[PDB]
Amino acid sequence: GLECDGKVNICCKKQFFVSFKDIGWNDWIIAPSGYHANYCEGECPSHIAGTSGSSLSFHSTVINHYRMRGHSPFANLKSCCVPTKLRPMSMLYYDDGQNIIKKDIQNMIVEECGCS
Amino acid sequence: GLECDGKVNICCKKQFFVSFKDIGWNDWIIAPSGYHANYCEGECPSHIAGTSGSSLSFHSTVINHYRMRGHSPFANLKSCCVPTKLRPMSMLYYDDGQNIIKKDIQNMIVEECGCS
Amino acid sequence: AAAAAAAAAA
Amino acid sequence: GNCWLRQAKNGRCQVLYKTELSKEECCSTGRLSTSWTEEDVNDNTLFKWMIFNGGAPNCIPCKETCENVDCGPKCRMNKKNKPRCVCAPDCSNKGPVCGLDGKTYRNECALLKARCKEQPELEVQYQGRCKKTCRDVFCPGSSTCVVDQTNNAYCVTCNRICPEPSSEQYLCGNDGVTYSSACHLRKATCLLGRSIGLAYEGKCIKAKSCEDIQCTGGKKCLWDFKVGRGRCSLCDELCPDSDEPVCASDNATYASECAMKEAACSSGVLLEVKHSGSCNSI
Amino acid sequence: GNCWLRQAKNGRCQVLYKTELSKEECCSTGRLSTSWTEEDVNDNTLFKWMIFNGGAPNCIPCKETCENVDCGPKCRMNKKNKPRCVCAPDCSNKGPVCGLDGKTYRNECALLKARCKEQPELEVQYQGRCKKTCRDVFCPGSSTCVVDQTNNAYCVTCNRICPEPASSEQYLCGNDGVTYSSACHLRKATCLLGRSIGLAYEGKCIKAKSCEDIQCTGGKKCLWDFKVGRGRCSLCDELCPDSDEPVCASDNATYASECAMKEAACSSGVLLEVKHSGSCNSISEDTEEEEE
């Protein structure tokens, strides 16, 4: 997990508020209006990608340990910083029938980011 | 959940196998001696976003209609394909105390990849 | 009394 | 030495990001939970540790006192003085209110205490214990009440930004009423403030039976002698297997939605959910 | 003209592909799960279909019958005549087995079957019910026997090429009381005693009368054991957050919560291990079986 506060420069999760207006689901979403979905961003370097704490850690480690010695289709696929935990969000909309439905969309937002 | 059975270029789980052997973890892991870890490779086009039967769709999708409509920032950030659900596997090796211990490396072998 | 417009699912 | 951001449940430093880095160096900042490694060992002794232990052994907790600590709304120490910044909702400025989640709260700080923990998308919605019927509600200034599928009250800003187009921007209200535009329905729905229903596609006609009623999307019309109208539903959906048992309009009990889709579908007619659980007179 | 990958448990089609493709050209392959949709829009509705729906409606499964289909290693028909791939490993060649995973299995076929159902790794490690200790267990080939923390014994292999280093200080001290040429040297001989001889301390093995006579690197704490009259260094800081209950004291005195059992030991610079779980009182016999 993380908190993208301060001059942090790693896979931290930067808070981010998305407006359904700004994307145009304005109309088919009832509320809630907008909301924070944030995301993952930061350099995914060395002695730190397996230290992430994230799910994707150990594996990521057992991977780099390859491109470290530029091996197979690997030396040229960079560990990019992604999401590794997302809780769902309950909202309100018109199903395909135009009725009014409250459901909780899964992994609609990001709890933790990780290196990969 | 998407095994790269061929003809494929979009994000699939290219499953393959590592041996602690060539890695040198060889030296403190009694058994096994390498295990099938899967990686993934594959492009991340927009059609295939909402689509992707995985978690990162909604978010990935919602992030899309940014660099989608050429919205400012993200740009720089490229959307990747990564492992989205991983399982753990039991391990047997020495510790610092140099004793033999049976563990399960929680969260070790990837088996569902996904675009981001 | 009231009503109850049909539904999608649950 | 080395610098970390989190101490695990069990101790052990985790989340390293500055190696080769003395303590008072990595300890100066006010962002708490920041702990310390005292030893340099960049080799995978480090990797090792995440396995052998929650992580890095001989962790060092920067503050054990809300000294120069920092945290968006405040600090409190307690227990094994493990100062954890928590929730300073800041009160003053009345009510026993409802929640945008649907859940009720004895009051607002009540809620502000919660919006602190997990959902910052957690709103208010309106004053007063939460309701399952538009019976009530002033709705903050300008925000029509409406009701969920579970038959529950919510307040909202109807969106009035979208009238006219189109070949068939043009659809049929489950209340009759030919609406001109998909979003237009949404509008009168909202204005009415309750699910109306897309009876089906295209302009409405008086017919007396489903045959007559076309239907694309491969949906399958069904009728309802209630108001006497047709309905272009979707029956291509299955389930044979969460769950729930309900009892329906006609005077019967069932299983899931799943349960009586083809109830209506496979058979004839449209049905509505009398209520959840069973209902009967012995 | 709309071709899909997987068929929801709900039925809705899911996981896309290409488009403007007919049923037949799409369903031209031998793949099991592949399905197709005649309807089409080109976005959203699709996606939208993720929200409200499981997947997509009107989802005609390419292959409704184990016919003309194909899998890795068989096809069988699910209750609902639902064609699915299944395990088949040839059988007909022994007794119930303790898999590498360290779980006892019904038989080889049972596990081979569960092999391709999940863990393409997993394979018989030795025959019989995963057994408690190397007493009466038969390892295959060069594979020797060993034990863990818990005990449940295993069959694995020990490397013999143990190249010795050149340096006055890359040595280690046996918990047994011997000094060892290196790690691999220790590691190695650990394997052969078939048991964990723990690490005592980094020094060449010296016979101090007491802890202060022991240096103690990595910043661990010494703890003496009067049972063998040698001390050793275990780290602490290992913090018991949350809860735990079991465990019975080795100092003839009931204990509660394992992590704790250590506490005292560390706090008391004296050793402590574990007898019969939960809580105890009496004895049983002196000495142990061994480990840290």
Side-chain angles (χ1 to χ4, degrees), chain A residues 1-6 8-13 15-46 48-84 86-111 113-116, chain B residues 1-6 8-13 15-46 48-84 86-111 113-116, chain C, chain D residues 1-8 10-37 39-73 75 77 79 81-83 85-93 95-105 107-112 114-117 119-122 124-128 130 132-134 136-168 170-207 210-213 215-243 245-271 273-280, chain E residues 1-37 39-73 75 77 79 81-83 85-93 95-105 107-112 114-117 119-122 124-128 130 132-134 136-169 171-208 211-214 216-244 246-281 289-290 292:
Chain A
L2 216 308
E3 213 55 32
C4 166
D5 320 325
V8 44
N9 97 242
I10 66 70
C11 197
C12 72
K13 91 175 161 193
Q15 177 204 191
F16 171 28
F17 186 102
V18 192
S19 163
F20 301 127
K21 198 269 170 179
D22 285 9
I23 205 160
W25 307 340
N26 166 112
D27 273 313
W28 68 276
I29 292 41
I30 278 42
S33 73
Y35 98 125
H36 304 90
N38 23 318
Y39 53 133
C40 298
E41 145 76 322
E43 187 195 23
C44 275
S46 63
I48 301 150
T51 311
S52 171
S54 120
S55 73
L56 278 167
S57 315
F58 165 123
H59 187 260
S60 169
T61 297
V62 76
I63 260 58
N64 166 59
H65 230 61
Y66 264 65
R67 137 275 292 352
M68 277 286 66
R69 311 90 151 128
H71 219 264
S72 291
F74 295 130
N76 45 219
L77 308 180
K78 299 193 183 191
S79 152
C80 73
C81 159
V82 302
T84 68
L86 310 57
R87 76 170 75 109
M89 170 144 167
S90 157
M91 320 173 320
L92 211 42
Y93 48 108
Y94 305 114
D95 60 345
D96 211 13
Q98 273 305 157
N99 347 348
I100 273 184
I101 314 299
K102 189 286 281 177
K103 280 210 280 287
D104 324 28
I105 294 56
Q106 302 309 318
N107 24 282
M108 196 182 137
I109 50 298
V110 184
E111 278 200 316
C113 297
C115 273
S116 326
Chain B
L2 175 178
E3 299 55 24
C4 339
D5 289 20
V8 27
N9 307 57
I10 108 283
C11 169
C12 37
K13 111 172 75 160
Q15 48 89 357
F16 100 107
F17 161 118
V18 165
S19 187
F20 304 143
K21 294 258 308 190
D22 323 330
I23 323 335
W25 294 15
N26 199 158
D27 301 28
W28 51 278
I29 316 197
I30 280 96
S33 77
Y35 69 89
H36 291 90
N38 319 337
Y39 65 117
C40 17
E41 38 191 345
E43 294 90 289
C44 294
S46 317
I48 351 209
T51 313
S52 54
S54 72
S55 32
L56 297 197
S57 44
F58 178 100
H59 189 265
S60 180
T61 302
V62 165
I63 298 305
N64 209 47
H65 304 71
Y66 280 120
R67 72 248 206 255
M68 199 52 174
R69 81 268 287 100
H71 219 284
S72 310
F74 294 102
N76 336 312
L77 161 284
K78 202 152 211 166
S79 150
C80 291
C81 152
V82 270
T84 70
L86 321 68
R87 94 174 58 105
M89 194 202 67
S90 297
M91 290 280 296
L92 183 70
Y93 52 90
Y94 302 97
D95 68 314
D96 304 288
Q98 280 303 160
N99 327 292
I100 304 136
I101 290 93
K102 188 276 173 62
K103 202 70 177 303
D104 322 36
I105 297 329
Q106 259 304 226
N107 213 42
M108 191 178 63
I109 173 183
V110 162
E111 56 97 34
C113 285
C115 268
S116 338
Chain D
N2 302 5
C3 192
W4 316 76
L5 274 330
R6 157 169 71 186
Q7 48 99 332
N10 87 103
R12 299 298 149 67
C13 285
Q14 45 192 5
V15 211
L16 163 158
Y17 71 121
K18 193 59 222 298
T19 167
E20 305 185 8
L21 212 275
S22 316
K23 169 213 180 163
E24 297 203 4
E25 275 161 30
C26 164
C27 206
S28 56
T29 313
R31 36 151 315 100
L32 72 133
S33 296
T34 274
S35 332
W36 215 51
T37 304
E39 179 161 47
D40 307 327
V41 46
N42 307 11
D43 30 305
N44 274 347
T45 313
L46 213 165
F47 190 73
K48 301 288 175 66
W49 289 331
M50 330 314 281
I51 294 45
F52 311 135
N53 337 317
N58 292 3
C59 202
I60 316 281
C62 260
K63 308 280 163 290
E64 54 282 13
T65 32
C66 312
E67 171 60 336
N68 303 255
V69 296
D70 188 7
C71 47
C75 196
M77 298 195 293
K79 304 323 193 70
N81 213 50
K82 222 49 183 289
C85 276
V86 299
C87 303
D90 165 8
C91 303
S92 49
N93 334 286
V97 305
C98 181
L100 146 43
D101 59 33
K103 303 205 86 171
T104 318
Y105 291 67
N107 59 64
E108 218 171 339
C109 279
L111 181 162
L112 308 210
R115 165 100 98 72
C116 161
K117 305 292 197 44
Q119 14 53 5
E121 286 306 289
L122 180 57
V124 152
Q125 179 176 137
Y126 51 73
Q127 232 206 209
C130 284
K132 270 50 173 202
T133 297
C134 267
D136 305 40
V137 184
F138 187 51
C139 286
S142 350
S143 34
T144 307
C145 178
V146 300
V147 215
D148 84 351
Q149 69 282 20
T150 321
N151 169 19
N152 305 11
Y154 310 72
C155 277
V156 194
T157 67
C158 292
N159 167 335
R160 15 261 282 168
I161 318 77
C162 87
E164 6 199 321
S166 300
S167 185
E168 207 82 332
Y170 216 24
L171 318 188
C172 193
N174 216 340
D175 55 2
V177 175
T178 272
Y179 300 84
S180 29
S181 110
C183 90
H184 255 290
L185 204 144
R186 287 130 145 239
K187 285 197 48 66
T189 319
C190 193
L191 189 290
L192 184 82
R194 161 176 41 114
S195 285
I196 293 169
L198 167 48
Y200 59 74
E201 329 242 25
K203 196 177 184 183
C204 310
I205 75 284
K206 263 196 207 170
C210 261
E211 65 288 305
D212 200 331
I213 314 196
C215 27
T216 87
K219 284 195 277 298
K220 294 169 76 185
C221 186
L222 37 77
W223 187 262
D224 61 302
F225 324 118
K226 334 192 187 277
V227 275
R229 284 204 219 110
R231 186 96 75 98
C232 263
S233 178
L234 177 54
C235 308
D236 135 292
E237 174 196 357
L238 66 151
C239 73
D241 307 33
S242 162
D243 197 38
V246 280
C247 193
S249 330
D250 73 320
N251 306 321
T253 329
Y254 267 115
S256 52
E257 50 112 17
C258 144
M260 79 315 301
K261 323 198 207 95
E262 18 70 312
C265 283
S266 297
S267 110
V269 188
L270 156 90
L271 307 170
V273 65
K274 205 98 136 269
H275 47 247
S276 79
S278 188
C279 113
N280 187 32
Chain E
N2 221 346
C3 185
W4 281 121
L5 226 20
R6 180 171 74 194
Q7 207 266 43
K9 294 193 186 188
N10 83 56
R12 262 97 255 279
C13 264
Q14 74 198 354
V15 188
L16 195 62
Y17 214 69
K18 197 82 276 166
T19 127
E20 13 267 6
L21 279 70
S22 137
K23 185 153 159 98
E24 210 95 2
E25 29 166 345
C26 147
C27 288
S28 64
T29 88
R31 184 272 211 3
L32 187 56
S33 328
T34 318
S35 293
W36 172 81
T37 282
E39 191 176 347
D40 309 59
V41 182
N42 114 303
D43 204 315
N44 204 15
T45 295
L46 272 283
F47 173 71
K48 224 70 101 333
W49 289 336
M50 304 339 286
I51 326 312
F52 343 96
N53 341 226
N58 318 339
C59 173
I60 40 261
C62 273
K63 322 219 174 268
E64 318 196 65
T65 332
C66 268
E67 77 154 316
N68 227 223
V69 34
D70 164 314
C71 338
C75 203
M77 293 272 46
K79 296 309 207 304
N81 200 129
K82 207 70 268 201
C85 298
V86 303
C87 311
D90 181 16
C91 300
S92 71
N93 319 121
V97 287
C98 173
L100 201 35
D101 75 331
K103 298 186 79 178
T104 287
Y105 284 87
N107 33 65
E108 294 200 27
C109 339
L111 100 58
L112 288 191
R115 146 90 70 90
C116 71
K117 204 57 171 209
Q119 25 197 304
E121 269 316 358
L122 185 50
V124 165
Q125 79 181 112
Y126 62 92
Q127 304 183 151
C130 282
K132 213 30 188 168
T133 154
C134 290
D136 179 24
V137 309
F138 188 103
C139 312
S142 308
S143 167
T144 28
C145 190
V146 205
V147 306
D148 57 347
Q149 56 197 33
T150 299
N151 260 39
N152 27 127
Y154 291 97
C155 298
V156 69
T157 336
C158 326
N159 95 307
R160 216 159 289 195
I161 27 89
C162 202
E164 58 60 28
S167 77
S168 70
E169 254 266 48
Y171 327 52
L172 309 141
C173 205
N175 256 346
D176 55 279
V178 166
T179 313
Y180 285 46
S181 189
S182 142
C184 157
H185 293 255
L186 201 175
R187 301 259 192 56
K188 183 167 163 283
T190 323
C191 201
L192 272 286
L193 183 52
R195 167 211 336 195
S196 332
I197 23 289
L199 172 70
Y201 47 98
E202 217 89 15
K204 298 173 181 191
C205 276
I206 148 274
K207 306 181 180 196
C211 275
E212 300 27 64
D213 314 40
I214 211 147
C216 212
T217 64
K220 336 166 180 186
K221 308 207 171 193
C222 163
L223 320 76
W224 200 264
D225 173 30
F226 312 79
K227 190 168 50 289
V228 293
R230 313 184 303 262
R232 130 245 332 200
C233 273
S234 176
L235 64 187
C236 164
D237 100 304
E238 166 65 30
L239 210 304
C240 177
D242 302 316
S243 47
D244 16 28
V247 342
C248 111
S250 59
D251 51 296
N252 289 351
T254 282
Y255 219 104
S257 163
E258 139 89 82
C259 198
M261 100 100 33
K262 297 178 283 328
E263 304 296 352
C266 240
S267 274
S268 78
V270 150
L271 195 60
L272 283 148
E273 285 171 359
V274 313
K275 293 213 273 269
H276 38 251
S277 291
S279 303
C280 48
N281 278 139
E289 280 167 333
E290 280 214 333
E292 106 175 331

